[PDB]
């Protein structure tokens, strides 16, 4: 049977994100001027289905969650796409027990995956972070999360 | 064609744990006298393989990670089994965006899944927590994590 494409997402899906050479950003507009780790050649995997793709290779205006398009936020002329999560995003340094933490480590708020797309073949994947606990970069980071409900 | 049994685990496996009617413990011996959320009827799922089982229905002396038996800690006469994780354990209130956090929420350490077994059909699953951010209990909790390397 044909596999479910990585473009189509459902609530409760387990997401696996690779962030090769991730760099540190002091303030990200999509996360309310908060630190983030971002990669230029990130890879997204649906763990249950096994499907995969490079973030730059996905047409992000066609990605649907529960049959509905992802939420869009235009910040300073840059269009960002949101993938909500149930819970926080769990990310760590590749191949090491060293494990990072997000900005809202104290709070009870869930996390989200943010993608910047230029409409072509250039996409940036952002994950929330508090400080440079995994280094200033470049650093290979693997993140895990569970897809949340559609924003209301 | 035969599926990989949930008794046999590998590094990089994605784990899905359900904690129905989870209770709060102020101090747990397996986590060095630190708060934890525990359930009596927990369910464990290997997300990639789709296999599942009740925690109480698993013979935990037969569970192998990378072909090796799980690490055991005898604490006050109670035998605990450890499932190491890559990164932290991500848990949230089931069905809600409300997301809990672990004890070492500023540290860079990874988390672990702790199981108490009596040798019969009674098993307790423990997940690290800092305070009663999800309530004193009972509360339904869903946890997600990636299996780490064997303890050395």
């Amino acid at each position, epitope marked *: 049977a044909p596999a479910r494409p990585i473009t189509n997402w459902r609530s409760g899906d387990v997401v696996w994100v690779t962030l090769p050479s991730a760099e540190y950003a002091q303030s990200q507009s999509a996360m309310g001027s908060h630190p983030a780790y971002w990669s230029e050649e990130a890879t997204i995997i649906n763990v249950a289905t096994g499907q995969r793709a490079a973030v730059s290779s996905i047409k992000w205006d066609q990605v649907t969650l529960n049959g509905k398009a992802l939420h869009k936020e235009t910040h300073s002329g840059l269009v960002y796409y949101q993938l909500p999560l149930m819970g926080k995003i769990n990310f760590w340094q590749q191949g090491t027990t060293k494990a990072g933490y997000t900005y809202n480590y104290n709070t009870t708020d869930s996390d989200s995956l943010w993608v910047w797309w230029d409409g072509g073949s250039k996409a940036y994947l952002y994950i929330s972070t508090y400080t440079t606990m995994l280094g200033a970069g470049p650093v290979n980071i693997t993140g895990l999360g569970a897809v949340g409900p559609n924003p209301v | 064609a035969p599926a990989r049994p949930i008794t046999n685990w590998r590094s990089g496996d994605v784990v*899905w744990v359900t904690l129905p009617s989870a209770e709060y413990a102020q101090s747990q011996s397996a986590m060095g006298s630190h708060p934890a959320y525990w359930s009596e009827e927990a369910t464990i799922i290997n997300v990639a393989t789709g296999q599942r089982a009740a925690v109480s229905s698993i013979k935990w002396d037969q569970v192998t990670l990378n072909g090796k038996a799980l690490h055991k800690e005898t604490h006050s006469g109670l035998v605990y089994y450890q499932l190491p994780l890559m990164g932290k354990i991500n848990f949230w209130q089931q069905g809600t965006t409300k997301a809990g956090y672990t004890y070492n929420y500023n540290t860079t350490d990874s988390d672990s899944l702790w199981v108490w077994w009596d040798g019969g059909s009674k098993a307790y699953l423990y997940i690290s927590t800092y305070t009663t951010m999800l309530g004193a209990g009972p509360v*339904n909790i869903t946890g997600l994590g990636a299996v780490g390397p064997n303890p050395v």
Partner: antibody
Framework: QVQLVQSGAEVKKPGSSVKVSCKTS????????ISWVRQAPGQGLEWLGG????????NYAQNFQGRLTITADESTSTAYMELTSLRSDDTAVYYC??????????????????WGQGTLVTVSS | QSALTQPASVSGSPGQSITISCTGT?????????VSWYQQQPGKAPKLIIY???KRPSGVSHRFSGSNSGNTASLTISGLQAEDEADYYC??????????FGTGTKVTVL
């Protein structure tokens, strides 16, 4: 053989709300799904909504969005549906059914192998 | 969302074969190789006869066969008998996380 047992038939006045429970005996919810289907007298089957208990993120049909709520309990293997603002055309036999697909993902490949006995709700006076 | 169109009335003599179609529109009805079929005799709860295109559950009579051709899923009943005089429905998954039931078909014996 797992069994799905529903609550008894109810009669409600227009504008009220009803709650039908589905009981799972011979097993647990595990990672399966629960769907609610109603059949008005003399008409066909209409899918109301469904849920996967481990996901606990219910989704409903367009006609019942903002009017139907579906919840599942893991401590007691009971699934619930709640329809508010009842009208005369809500009179139907409501069925609880199990989505016989072990993987919560791959939910497109699914079937309703066991069906509940059916609860008849009458909305009149 | 538009429902699945079904041939409301289908009839056949005892012994022949009949085919019930299930036609939909849009990609929101999913692939037709994964359409399930149910049978509802008068006064009874619906029961599954064909699922996953052409897979039969245990105890279902081997006279029920399911096909798939483009945007139409077909259920075929061979050797019509008095116990096949019931109502049959097709169901499928949607791009939105929902299930759509067919309009329903009544089988009659001449």
């Amino acid at each position: 053989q797992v069994q799905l047992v529903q609550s008894g038939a109810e009669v409600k006045k227009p504008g009220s709300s009803v709650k039908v429970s589905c009981k799972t005996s011979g097993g647990t919810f595990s990672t399966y799904g629960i769907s609610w289907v109603r059949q008005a007298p003399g008409q066909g089957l209409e899918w109301l909504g469904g849920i996967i208990p481990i996901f606990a993120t219910p989704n409903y049909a367009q006609n019942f969005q903002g009017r139907l709520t579906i919840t599942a309990d893991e401590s007691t293997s009971t699934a619930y549906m709640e329809l508010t603002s009842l009208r005369s055309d809500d009179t139907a036999v409501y069925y609880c059914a199990r989505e016989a697909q072990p993987n919560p993902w791959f939910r497109e490949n699914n079937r309703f192998d066991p069906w509940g006995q059916g609860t008849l709700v009458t909305v009149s006076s | 969302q538009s429902a699945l169109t079904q041939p409301a009335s289908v009839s056949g003599s005892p012994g022949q074969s009949i085919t019930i179609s299930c036609t939909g529109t849009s990609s929101d009805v999913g692939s037709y190789d994964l359409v399930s079929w149910y049978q509802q005799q008068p006064g009874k709860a619906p029961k599954l006869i064909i699922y996953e295109g052409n897979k039969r559950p245990s105890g279902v009579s081997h006279r029920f066969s399911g096909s798939n051709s483009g945007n139409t899923a077909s259920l075929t009943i061979s050797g019509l008998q008095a116990e096949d005089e019931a109502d049959y429905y097709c169901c499928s998954f949607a791009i939105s996380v929902t299930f759509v039931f067919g309009t329903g078909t009544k089988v009659t014996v001449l």
